[PDB]
Amino acid sequence: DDDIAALVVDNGSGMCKAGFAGDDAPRAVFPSIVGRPRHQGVMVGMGQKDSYVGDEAQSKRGILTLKYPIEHGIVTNWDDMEKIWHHTFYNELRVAPEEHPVLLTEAPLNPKANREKMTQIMFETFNTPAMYVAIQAVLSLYASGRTTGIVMDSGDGVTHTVPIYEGYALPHAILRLDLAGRDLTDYLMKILTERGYSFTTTAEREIVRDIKEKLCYVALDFEQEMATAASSSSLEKSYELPDGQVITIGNERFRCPEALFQPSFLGMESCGIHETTFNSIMKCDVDIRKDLYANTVLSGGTTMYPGIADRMQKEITALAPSTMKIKIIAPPERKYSVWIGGSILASLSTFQQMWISKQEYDESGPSIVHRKCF
Amino acid sequence: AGWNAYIDNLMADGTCQDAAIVGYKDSPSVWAAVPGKTFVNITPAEVGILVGKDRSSFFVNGLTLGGQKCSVIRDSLLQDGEFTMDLRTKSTGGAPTFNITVTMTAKTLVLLMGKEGVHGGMINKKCYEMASHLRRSQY
Ligand SMILES: Nc1ncnc2c1ncn2[C@@H]1O[C@H](COP(=O)(O)OP(=O)(O)OP(=O)(O)O)[C@@H](O)[C@H]1O
Ligand SMILES: [Sr+2]
């Protein structure tokens, strides 16, 4: 009951969500950036603070230089990830690390030495009673109330299709696609600027993020949808600049998420998202495939587009053997699946016999993460 | 009593339901196994699969251990300083399934099956600590 409860920390490329096990939603969701002034700064209503972290650095992003620790799901910068975590405990949840076990999540296929460095930091640097590292797609599955299935996880920096047999991700059949939400904010701004629009001032580079999230749609049939842009009337919608000015968006709204299905739109040779779910399924055990088609779960902010469940269904139904029951699952709380799957898991009395304890870390060293976290 | 001290050891704390030591060298041969359970029955063919040069078709096709069918979850059996392959058992007719780790030491293959509800990591960690004690023995 609150003070004592593990803290679930979900470490996303664009966003971090952190809270307490047994809770329904993340208590702190924040931007995954560290921003240092690159000109000796400090407001005189703060210490000589030259790294702002999370959202208090979003609102000075324009005056600051921002480093992204997590990248395509993997941590590229270890002291700036250390900063983020210190801010998670000591400023966002207002917690003490040495009294709470932590469940940290991690990327499917996360490099060996990364798993060990986050075991390392957490134990030696934050003196954690215990910890566990779960793959993100597997907590998306548990939170839908399922144990076998394949999750299609699309965040800001990566997409993976993960087949899971009985709570265990099958690493050989995991496939990674480096095209997710940022790729789609970027491509939206270029097709909007191609229409002679002007997103010239800093804040307003972040104003394409809201058009993208507010007006984009996934088309069932891109082709009959494009001529159901030329039979206009109802497709153009408008967006208002801070500047007072107006935007009008039409074929762009559905042409943006389409780069997920056809990454040729982006200039990428990659298969789209519908083929990658199908190619992980083909790499799995012959006797669980029928289970993986019946349990295709989508999770992550980039899966929030209207039409994506239907269009994912339509498309997997075309590649799949002519009989498979294909059940695409798209729980309405799926921007937060990885965090509430971990909150469930780290609250079961089941889980306390599943952590790596301070004792064990001493006993073994950092290597033990490979043994116990699968 | 010999290799049996390892297996009665593995079994000591009521998390496993089976254990076995298998010389994979020359003709594979079980050297100690929990009597009358599955691994007492492992065979050369299946050993050949566990230590096979083809490290991939066991992912689609599956493998049997005893006559028990099993999905391969991780395989880092032949990989240095890893030595483990982790497996889960396939069911029919609703029966429970079970995690398995196999650890290759210099000569031995130590396998150990969890009871229902025990998590793949307890097994991996336990079967690996036991096997360490084979590898630091020229076994
Ligand atoms: N309604 C929406 N439509 C489209 N995209 C959305 C919507 N809501 C959020 N997003 C996008 O989802 C992304 C954030 O999702 P998410 O929290 O899953 O990613 P992340 O965890 O930070 O990244 P990663 O998996 O790469 O680690 C952002 O790019 C955001 O623009
Ligand atoms: Sr994520």
XYZ file of C-alpha atoms and ligand atoms in Angstrom:
545
model
C 0.000 0.000 0.000
C 1.925 2.892 -1.708
C 4.949 2.883 0.451
C 5.867 -0.359 -0.775
C 5.156 -1.065 -4.078
C 7.792 -1.375 -6.730
C 8.188 1.641 -9.010
C 7.598 0.704 -12.668
C 9.950 2.841 -14.938
C 9.246 2.510 -18.629
C 12.099 3.919 -20.687
C 10.983 5.122 -24.014
C 12.844 6.791 -26.807
C 10.419 9.722 -26.853
C 8.639 9.378 -23.503
C 9.288 7.883 -20.007
C 6.333 6.847 -17.787
C 6.979 6.027 -14.122
C 4.685 5.107 -11.302
C 3.779 2.718 -8.637
C 2.873 -0.911 -8.989
C -0.745 -1.560 -8.292
C -1.756 1.625 -10.196
C -3.944 2.127 -13.126
C -1.915 4.865 -14.966
C 1.628 6.350 -14.984
C 2.026 9.138 -12.359
C 4.872 10.881 -14.228
C 4.949 10.819 -18.002
C 7.823 13.019 -19.335
C 9.937 13.918 -22.390
C 13.122 11.764 -22.721
C 15.630 14.528 -23.074
C 18.400 16.236 -21.016
C 18.921 19.844 -22.023
C 22.079 21.785 -21.186
C 22.129 25.601 -21.853
C 25.160 25.703 -24.295
C 25.412 29.270 -22.843
C 25.909 29.489 -19.061
C 22.378 29.745 -17.903
C 20.177 29.711 -14.770
C 16.982 31.481 -13.851
C 17.248 33.208 -10.377
C 14.625 30.899 -9.098
C 16.843 27.889 -9.500
C 20.353 26.736 -8.482
C 23.190 26.943 -11.115
C 21.297 24.129 -12.865
C 22.657 23.573 -16.320
C 20.920 20.255 -17.189
C 17.131 20.611 -17.305
C 15.507 17.111 -17.636
C 12.132 15.923 -19.032
C 9.410 18.647 -19.458
C 11.066 21.597 -17.690
C 13.476 21.283 -20.608
C 10.744 21.003 -23.200
C 9.657 24.559 -22.162
C 13.092 26.075 -22.811
C 13.904 23.603 -25.711
C 14.115 26.576 -27.977
C 16.756 28.199 -25.709
C 18.601 24.940 -24.859
C 20.608 22.105 -26.465
C 18.901 18.762 -25.940
C 20.562 15.284 -25.780
C 18.392 12.113 -26.261
C 19.789 9.188 -24.173
C 17.547 6.459 -25.522
C 17.667 5.925 -29.253
C 15.785 3.349 -31.365
C 14.952 1.945 -27.940
C 18.643 1.403 -26.947
C 20.613 3.726 -24.532
C 23.412 5.491 -26.308
C 24.341 7.841 -23.491
C 24.789 6.436 -20.061
C 25.350 9.471 -17.771
C 22.427 11.316 -19.315
C 20.224 8.206 -18.818
C 21.602 8.295 -15.194
C 20.353 11.824 -14.936
C 16.869 10.834 -16.138
C 16.537 8.118 -13.558
C 17.767 10.363 -10.658
C 15.019 12.871 -11.780
C 12.397 10.018 -11.983
C 12.980 9.115 -8.251
C 14.145 12.334 -6.632
C 12.026 14.880 -8.495
C 9.102 13.153 -10.206
C 7.897 10.379 -7.905
C 9.702 11.926 -4.843
C 10.927 8.514 -3.808
C 13.958 6.911 -2.304
C 15.582 4.238 -4.419
C 16.871 2.121 -1.472
C 13.436 1.166 -0.183
C 11.589 0.135 -3.460
C 12.310 -2.558 -5.953
C 12.278 -1.296 -9.545
C 10.957 -2.955 -12.662
C 12.788 -1.156 -15.520
C 11.587 -2.001 -19.022
C 13.881 -2.677 -21.956
C 13.905 -2.995 -25.780
C 13.321 -6.389 -27.476
C 16.774 -7.594 -28.487
C 18.531 -5.010 -26.108
C 22.356 -5.517 -26.283
C 24.011 -7.725 -23.563
C 26.192 -5.050 -22.052
C 23.252 -2.675 -21.845
C 21.274 -5.086 -19.682
C 24.331 -5.382 -17.463
C 24.988 -1.632 -17.319
C 21.438 -0.951 -16.188
C 21.788 -3.763 -13.545
C 25.097 -2.193 -12.548
C 23.785 1.459 -12.155
C 20.576 0.471 -10.471
C 22.410 -1.568 -7.828
C 25.637 0.269 -7.163
C 24.596 3.846 -8.046
C 20.984 3.791 -6.732
C 21.338 0.979 -4.169
C 18.179 -0.759 -5.167
C 16.817 -3.541 -2.870
C 15.953 -5.484 -6.071
C 15.247 -5.130 -9.679
C 13.906 -6.787 -12.805
C 14.183 -5.886 -16.470
C 11.244 -6.887 -18.649
C 11.054 -6.529 -22.509
C 8.322 -3.948 -23.329
C 6.139 -6.015 -25.713
C 5.736 -8.804 -23.135
C 4.110 -6.324 -20.598
C 1.808 -5.058 -23.391
C 0.607 -8.709 -23.671
C 0.146 -9.439 -19.962
C -1.847 -6.170 -19.610
C -4.346 -7.381 -22.334
C -4.664 -10.454 -20.179
C -2.749 -12.759 -22.333
C 0.258 -14.960 -22.299
C 0.747 -16.163 -25.865
C 0.433 -13.748 -28.827
C 2.567 -11.288 -30.770
C 2.648 -7.607 -29.997
C 3.390 -4.976 -32.550
C 4.930 -2.135 -30.579
C 5.317 1.292 -32.164
C 6.800 4.032 -30.152
C 8.842 7.109 -31.195
C 12.100 5.571 -32.205
C 11.323 1.888 -33.063
C 8.812 -0.747 -33.954
C 9.144 -4.395 -33.194
C 7.083 -7.426 -33.756
C 7.723 -9.820 -30.811
C 6.198 -13.381 -30.742
C 5.573 -14.434 -27.085
C 4.956 -18.088 -26.021
C 3.733 -18.301 -22.468
C 5.164 -14.932 -21.236
C 8.491 -15.426 -23.033
C 9.489 -13.400 -26.035
C 10.996 -15.487 -28.782
C 14.227 -13.496 -29.617
C 14.971 -15.238 -32.948
C 11.604 -14.194 -34.437
C 11.732 -10.584 -33.063
C 12.019 -8.082 -35.894
C 12.931 -4.389 -35.518
C 11.831 -1.556 -37.757
C 13.345 1.771 -37.483
C 10.398 3.833 -38.385
C 8.014 5.004 -35.702
C 6.330 8.285 -34.474
C 9.301 10.661 -35.155
C 9.600 9.405 -38.706
C 5.933 10.255 -39.148
C 6.113 13.776 -37.555
C 8.991 14.519 -39.863
C 7.353 13.276 -43.020
C 4.191 15.200 -42.212
C 6.159 18.535 -41.919
C 7.871 17.905 -45.298
C 4.646 17.124 -47.116
C 3.069 20.235 -45.350
C 6.117 22.534 -46.236
C 5.996 21.074 -49.781
C 2.548 22.710 -49.952
C 4.468 26.016 -49.384
C 3.890 26.086 -45.580
C 6.289 27.496 -43.135
C 7.203 25.771 -39.831
C 9.985 28.076 -39.299
C 10.108 28.742 -35.519
C 11.302 26.086 -32.963
C 8.041 25.664 -30.914
C 6.234 25.298 -34.230
C 8.528 22.283 -35.185
C 6.673 20.683 -32.342
C 3.384 21.990 -33.893
C 3.474 19.291 -36.586
C 3.409 16.706 -33.660
C -0.115 17.936 -32.758
C -1.465 18.021 -36.385
C -0.061 14.467 -36.780
C -1.593 13.252 -33.672
C -4.804 15.249 -34.101
C -5.835 14.841 -37.716
C -4.003 11.750 -39.075
C -5.862 8.691 -40.084
C -5.004 5.355 -41.662
C -6.809 4.642 -44.905
C -8.337 1.168 -45.671
C -7.582 1.484 -49.251
C -4.930 4.225 -49.763
C -5.806 4.147 -53.525
C -9.568 4.642 -53.296
C -8.777 7.029 -50.407
C -6.674 9.352 -52.512
C -9.582 9.922 -54.968
C -11.689 10.259 -51.866
C -9.465 13.243 -51.151
C -10.076 14.550 -54.800
C -13.897 14.174 -54.082
C -13.081 16.563 -51.293
C -15.841 18.498 -49.478
C -15.219 16.742 -46.082
C -11.478 15.824 -46.001
C -9.652 19.134 -45.483
C -9.458 20.171 -41.864
C -7.771 23.262 -40.407
C -5.162 23.900 -37.841
C -4.408 27.225 -36.217
C -0.946 28.481 -35.588
C 0.004 30.246 -32.272
C 0.837 32.980 -34.832
C -3.028 33.405 -35.487
C -2.523 31.889 -39.019
C -4.309 28.881 -40.668
C -3.229 25.470 -41.974
C -5.348 23.319 -44.136
C -4.676 19.602 -44.413
C -6.274 17.159 -46.704
C -4.630 14.155 -48.432
C -1.771 14.506 -46.032
C -3.743 13.258 -43.008
C -3.878 9.620 -44.235
C -0.684 9.873 -46.437
C 1.333 10.405 -43.188
C 0.587 7.019 -41.328
C 0.814 5.252 -44.761
C 4.564 5.364 -44.507
C 4.120 2.637 -41.863
C 2.628 0.283 -44.458
C 4.737 1.427 -47.383
C 8.142 2.778 -46.172
C 8.970 3.574 -49.819
C 7.023 6.761 -49.030
C 9.857 7.512 -46.671
C 12.626 6.449 -49.137
C 13.200 3.242 -47.167
C 13.589 -0.173 -48.560
C 11.773 -1.686 -45.519
C 8.711 -3.832 -45.581
C 5.818 -2.181 -43.822
C 4.401 -3.087 -40.491
C 1.942 -5.632 -41.886
C 4.605 -7.772 -43.445
C 6.907 -7.680 -40.461
C 4.120 -9.105 -38.075
C 3.738 -11.876 -40.750
C 7.457 -12.536 -41.057
C 7.946 -12.966 -37.244
C 4.992 -15.406 -37.151
C 6.660 -17.424 -39.887
C 9.869 -17.725 -37.847
C 8.137 -19.240 -34.832
C 7.289 -22.817 -33.817
C 4.864 -24.377 -36.203
C 2.515 -25.250 -33.282
C 2.075 -21.710 -31.835
C 1.472 -19.771 -35.085
C -2.258 -20.300 -34.879
C -2.048 -18.719 -31.467
C 0.008 -15.779 -32.689
C -2.610 -14.931 -35.465
C -5.487 -15.027 -32.961
C -3.623 -12.659 -30.642
C -2.076 -9.837 -32.605
C -1.981 -6.938 -30.069
C -0.876 -3.445 -30.995
C 0.789 -1.236 -28.431
C 2.602 2.191 -28.376
C 1.681 5.846 -29.316
C 2.114 5.335 -33.118
C -0.688 2.595 -32.983
C -3.235 5.154 -31.991
C -4.228 6.179 -35.546
C -7.922 5.776 -36.547
C -8.196 2.902 -39.000
C -4.992 1.035 -37.896
C -6.758 -2.017 -36.384
C -8.941 -2.484 -39.498
C -6.112 -1.904 -41.911
C -3.774 -4.203 -39.956
C -6.578 -6.874 -40.028
C -7.289 -6.394 -43.802
C -3.592 -6.770 -44.520
C -2.700 -9.719 -42.351
C -5.839 -11.397 -43.647
C -4.421 -11.113 -47.193
C -0.977 -12.702 -46.409
C -2.269 -15.326 -43.903
C -3.318 -18.922 -44.977
C -6.961 -18.836 -46.180
C -8.328 -20.216 -42.935
C -6.531 -18.481 -40.021
C -8.924 -16.780 -37.553
C -7.079 -13.433 -37.336
C -7.945 -11.341 -34.317
C -6.088 -8.026 -34.177
C -6.472 -6.603 -30.535
C -6.254 -2.900 -29.960
C -7.204 -2.132 -26.385
C -8.211 1.521 -26.128
C -5.536 2.184 -23.433
C -2.668 1.120 -25.616
C -0.503 4.318 -25.605
C 0.136 3.055 -21.985
C 0.250 -0.824 -22.396
C 3.908 -1.308 -21.510
C 3.531 0.646 -18.238
C 0.240 -1.005 -16.995
C 1.503 -4.475 -17.835
C 4.485 -3.847 -15.548
C 2.321 -2.239 -12.823
C 0.176 -5.526 -12.793
C 3.142 -7.800 -12.869
C 5.201 -6.038 -10.159
C 2.148 -6.005 -7.847
C 1.485 -9.781 -7.876
C 2.986 -11.617 -4.835
C 4.116 -13.969 -7.601
C 6.694 -11.450 -8.740
C 8.732 -11.021 -5.560
C 10.156 -14.423 -6.410
C 11.313 -13.222 -9.815
C 13.523 -10.203 -8.957
C 17.307 -10.074 -8.820
C 18.078 -9.058 -5.251
C 20.929 -6.956 -3.834
C 22.255 -10.221 -2.376
C 22.232 -11.954 -5.784
C 23.894 -9.084 -7.528
C 26.804 -9.346 -5.028
C 26.847 -13.049 -5.359
C 27.027 -12.951 -9.164
C 27.845 -9.533 -10.434
C 25.963 -7.808 -13.374
C 25.888 -10.930 -15.576
C 22.994 -12.468 -13.536
C 20.475 -10.272 -15.554
C 20.924 -12.761 -18.417
C 20.015 -15.663 -16.292
C 17.064 -14.321 -14.467
C 15.372 -12.161 -16.967
C 14.464 -15.238 -19.220
C 26.403 -41.192 -4.265
C 28.368 -39.838 -7.208
C 26.711 -37.738 -9.909
C 23.525 -38.460 -8.035
C 24.595 -35.841 -5.363
C 24.155 -33.092 -8.079
C 20.702 -34.233 -9.067
C 19.408 -34.880 -5.530
C 20.933 -31.467 -4.864
C 19.117 -29.844 -7.852
C 15.907 -31.342 -6.586
C 16.414 -30.179 -2.958
C 14.215 -27.123 -2.841
C 10.914 -27.943 -4.439
C 11.048 -25.890 -7.478
C 12.177 -28.558 -10.022
C 10.447 -31.632 -11.120
C 13.328 -33.286 -13.179
C 17.152 -33.123 -13.460
C 19.747 -35.051 -15.450
C 23.427 -35.165 -16.317
C 24.192 -36.494 -19.712
C 27.689 -37.061 -21.212
C 27.132 -35.560 -24.676
C 30.614 -36.859 -25.628
C 31.034 -39.805 -28.062
C 27.804 -41.949 -27.522
C 25.587 -39.627 -25.438
C 24.767 -41.284 -22.155
C 22.765 -40.247 -19.136
C 25.033 -40.298 -16.096
C 22.499 -39.416 -13.410
C 18.865 -38.504 -13.872
C 15.792 -38.174 -11.660
C 14.435 -41.767 -11.921
C 11.400 -42.546 -13.953
C 10.737 -39.018 -15.163
C 11.452 -37.610 -18.694
C 15.196 -36.983 -19.061
C 16.081 -40.535 -17.966
C 14.885 -41.213 -21.458
C 16.896 -38.659 -23.535
C 18.391 -40.216 -26.628
C 21.408 -39.698 -28.975
C 19.321 -38.183 -31.764
C 17.930 -35.478 -29.442
C 21.310 -34.831 -27.964
C 22.500 -34.444 -31.603
C 19.783 -31.874 -31.983
C 20.895 -30.053 -28.732
C 24.513 -29.782 -29.799
C 23.879 -29.698 -33.535
C 25.684 -27.613 -35.956
C 22.270 -26.550 -37.290
C 21.356 -23.988 -34.777
C 18.168 -22.783 -36.389
C 15.531 -25.281 -37.425
C 14.746 -26.099 -33.852
C 12.802 -22.783 -33.829
C 10.092 -23.716 -36.350
C 10.168 -27.421 -36.099
C 10.681 -27.931 -32.382
C 12.721 -30.524 -30.504
C 11.931 -33.437 -28.183
C 13.761 -34.261 -24.999
C 12.640 -37.704 -23.756
C 9.670 -37.906 -26.042
C 8.534 -34.562 -24.645
C 8.030 -31.838 -27.326
C 9.636 -28.456 -26.477
C 9.818 -24.882 -28.032
C 13.270 -23.313 -27.944
C 13.061 -19.867 -26.302
C 16.777 -18.797 -26.169
C 19.667 -20.713 -27.448
C 23.158 -19.615 -26.423
C 24.223 -23.247 -25.737
C 27.292 -23.260 -27.964
C 28.224 -19.677 -27.146
C 31.094 -18.948 -24.864
C 30.485 -17.765 -21.393
C 26.765 -18.336 -22.053
C 26.294 -22.152 -22.237
C 22.477 -22.020 -21.836
C 19.479 -22.890 -23.910
C 16.142 -22.244 -22.312
C 13.070 -24.222 -23.364
C 9.316 -24.448 -22.736
C 7.198 -27.623 -23.151
C 4.184 -27.886 -25.561
C 0.790 -29.102 -24.294
C -2.182 -30.945 -25.647
C -5.448 -31.203 -23.864
C -4.877 -28.349 -21.521
C -2.007 -29.837 -19.453
C 0.498 -27.383 -17.696
C 3.800 -26.358 -19.367
C 7.289 -26.124 -17.863
C 10.545 -24.235 -18.330
C 13.819 -26.199 -19.012
C 17.463 -24.918 -19.116
C 20.228 -27.029 -20.574
C 23.744 -26.015 -19.801
C 26.694 -27.399 -21.762
C 29.832 -27.784 -19.670
C 33.031 -29.254 -20.985
C 31.648 -32.895 -21.153
C 28.276 -32.814 -19.474
C 24.817 -31.526 -20.400
C 22.813 -30.523 -17.235
C 19.080 -30.104 -17.858
C 16.502 -29.234 -15.138
C 12.695 -28.743 -15.497
C 10.670 -26.424 -13.278
C 7.471 -27.266 -11.490
C 4.424 -25.513 -12.983
C 4.518 -21.783 -12.191
C 8.280 -21.530 -11.553
C 9.853 -18.887 -13.827
C 12.487 -19.568 -16.512
C 15.110 -17.441 -14.631
C 15.149 -19.482 -11.369
C 15.739 -22.507 -13.488
C 18.342 -20.825 -15.645
C 20.220 -19.399 -12.748
C 20.062 -22.751 -10.712
C 20.980 -25.044 -13.616
C 23.826 -22.620 -14.470
C 25.252 -22.363 -10.913
C 25.293 -26.231 -10.657
C 27.042 -26.632 -14.016
C 29.669 -24.037 -12.919
C 30.657 -26.589 -10.356
C 31.142 -29.110 -13.213
C 33.078 -26.743 -15.441
C 35.408 -25.806 -12.531
C 36.230 -29.532 -12.276
C 37.189 -30.589 -15.844
C 33.770 -32.027 -16.444
N -2.973 9.755 -31.318
C -1.697 9.551 -31.729
N -1.439 9.385 -33.042
C -0.231 9.209 -33.493
N 0.849 9.172 -32.776
C 0.585 9.349 -31.482
C -0.637 9.537 -30.860
N -0.420 9.665 -29.514
C 0.931 9.552 -29.351
N 1.534 9.359 -30.567
C 2.946 9.225 -30.911
O 3.490 8.130 -30.230
C 4.860 8.375 -29.875
C 5.022 8.090 -28.383
O 4.641 6.703 -28.146
P 5.458 5.911 -27.092
O 5.188 6.381 -25.741
O 4.886 4.551 -27.334
O 6.944 5.891 -27.500
P 8.311 5.786 -26.790
O 8.113 4.878 -25.655
O 8.820 7.026 -26.219
O 9.352 5.097 -27.810
P 10.124 3.763 -28.197
O 9.318 2.533 -28.231
O 10.828 3.893 -29.421
O 11.013 3.535 -27.049
C 5.158 9.822 -30.225
O 5.876 9.839 -31.446
C 3.741 10.404 -30.428
O 3.747 11.385 -31.473
Sr 8.213 2.073 -25.691
